[PDB]
From Swiss-Prot:
Monomer. Found in a complex with LTF, CLU, EPPIN and SEMG1. Found in a complex with MPO and LTF; interacts directly with CP, allows Fe(3+) incorporation into LTF and activation of CP ferroxidase activity. Glycans are attached at residues 27, 135, 204. Belongs to the transferrin family. Hydrogencarbonate 2 binds at residues 118, 122, 124-125. Poly-N-acetyllactosaminic carbohydrate moiety seems to be needed for TLR4 activation. The chain holds residues 361 to 705 of 708 of the full protein. It is found in: Secreted; Cytoplasmic granule. Fe(3+) 2 binds at residues 54, 92, 185, 254. This is Lactotransferrin. The gene is LTF. Disulfide bonds join 7-39, 17-30, 64-339, 84-306, 116-191, 140-334, 150-164, 161-174, 232-246, 284-289. The lineage of its organism: Eukaryota, Metazoa, Chordata, Craniata, Vertebrata. Transferrins are iron binding transport proteins which can bind two Fe(3+) ions in association with the binding of an anion, usually bicarbonate. Residues 4-333 form the Transferrin-like domain.
Length: 341
């Protein structure tokens, strides 16, 4: 039993996974696919064991019978005595971010603007903002709301992909993987930072992690926090320090999923793998760090302190929360219970 097959999304995650595989002495090995959905399918077929997923994807995986195993836990300021692995998770803040210099843009004037999204089907990047927009407009035509977008996973010829840039060669425009310039938390924030889009749908952490010298990357080197504003649901604009009072939702943390039959073994191996290559890992600083990838958030978010135990042995619905689950279901009525594959 003692061999885990991880699923990497796109070639950059594949490279990191391969490095992890070498360092783990083949206790972990690698399968790779072009999209998160394709990785879920590999897991369903039994051709991979597990991968770490945004909540929108957990919904897809869970409808197909896959179960939550361990959750990303970032640093906090409550439960400070408990070990990270045993500390409850707090969830992240889904936000809408704009330029300060884009004056007079508010939640209530987004129609016909230009948007940047992590990917179709993701929590902060898609399910939350598009769910809110569908409800408020009373329309399922969320594909005509913004003039142009980068929403990796959408039809490449459509307005929803028009602002996506693809790779160095301009290949893979709008692919939902790290090859697409504007993919994920960091890519969607870059899309806003470079003024390609008017609004980015990301999380609070993303803004902090890519401003005021936190990044060193060329697009991010020179970005100042005061040059960004958050859009509140009441139509107000706030500094990025006010995220606790100006967010779109609180999201369940990204989490590892697997087949029920493999969950116990995946959990055992991962707890051991992080003891070696996690935050204070025995071999991290030094040989390999599983939670770093120079802000590219590959396999796991770079702000992950550890993978934490769940408790209550939750179903995917209990993990995501009834609130969020119904919000996703309601949104998916635009595009009632079954596996998508
Ligand atoms: C988009 O609009 C949807 C329809 O109004 C909405 O779904 C509704 O969500 C609410 C709150 O989550 C549910 O109301 C629930 O209220 C309490 C929560 O403790 C429960 O005791 C009730 O049993 C009930 O479930 C509605 O049931 C639900 N409506 C439907 C028809 O599914 C979405 O939340 C909206 N989406 C977003 C992103 O805001
Ligand atoms: C929005 O996201 C921000 C980035 O995640 C986050 O700021 C971070 O918050 C933690 C504590 O909550 C800070 O604490 C860290 O740094 C101190 C010393 O500087 C250490 O003692 C701690 O061990 C810990 O590592 C982070 O410094 C801080 N990150 C940055 C780069 O600013 C905000 O809390 C988030 N806002 C909301 C409302 O949730
Ligand atoms: O505990 C069993 C119980 O779980 C309920 O769902 C919980 C999730 O377990 C929990 O993770 C979630 O927590 C947060 C998450 O960030 C967001 O959902 C946010 O909106 O709320 C929390 C903020 O910290 O909360 C949900 C409940 O909202 C199931 O609904 C229930 O069926 C089950 O019995
Ligand atoms: C690969 O996995 C094996 C099996 O779990 C690990 O070997 C175990 O190491 C643990 C922790 O020190 C011991 O408690 C067990 O006695 C060992 N079991 C067996 C059967 O060898 C091994 O450490 C792992 N290697 C790496 C680098 O991840
Ligand atoms: Fe997410
Ligand atoms: Zn709130
Ligand atoms: Zn339960």
């Amino acid at each position: 039993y003692t061999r885990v097959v991880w699923c990497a999304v796109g070639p950059e995650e594949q490279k990191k996974c391969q490095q992890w595989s070498q360092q783990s002495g083949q206790n972990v090995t690698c399968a790779t696919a072009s999209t998160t959905d394709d990785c879920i399918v590999l897991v369903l077929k039994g051709e991979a064991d597990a991968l770490n997923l945004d909540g929108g994807y957990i919904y897809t995986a869970g409808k197909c019978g896959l179960v939550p195993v361990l959750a990303e836990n970032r640093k906090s300021s409550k439960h400070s005595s408990l070990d990270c692995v045993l500390r409850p998770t707090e969830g992240y803040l889904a936000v809408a971010v704009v330029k300060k210099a884009n004056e007079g843009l508010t939640w209530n004037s987004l129609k016909d603007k230009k948007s940047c999204h992590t990917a179709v089907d993701r929590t902060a990047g898609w399910n939350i903002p598009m769910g809110l927009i569908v409800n408020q407009t009373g329309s399922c035509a969320f594909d005509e709301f913004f003039s142009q977008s980068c929403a990796p996973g959408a039809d490449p010829k459509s307005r929803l992909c028009a602002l996506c840039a693809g790779d160095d060669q301009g290949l893979d425009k709008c692919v939902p993987n790290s090859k697409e310039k504007y993919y994920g938390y960091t890519g969607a924030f870059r899309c806003l930072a470079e003024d390609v889009g008017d609004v980015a749908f990301v999380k609070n952490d993303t803004v902090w992690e890519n401003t005021n010298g936190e990044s060193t990357a060329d697009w991010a080197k020179n970005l100042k926090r005061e040059d960004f504003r958050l859009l509140c649901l009441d139509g107000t604009r706030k500094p990025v320090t006010e995220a606790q009072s100006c967010h779109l939702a609180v999201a369940p943390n990204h989490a590892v999923v697997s087949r029920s039959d493999r969950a116990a073994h995946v959990e055992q191996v991962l707890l051991h793998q992080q003891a070696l290559f996690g935050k204070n890992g025995k071999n991290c600083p030094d040989k390999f760090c599983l939670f770093k990838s120079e802000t590219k958030n590959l396999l796991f978010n770079d702000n992950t302190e550890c993978l934490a135990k769940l408790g209550g042995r939750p179903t995917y619905e209990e993990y995501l929360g009834t609130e969020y689950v119904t919000a996703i279901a309601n949104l998916k009525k635009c595009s009632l219970e079954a596996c998508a594959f």
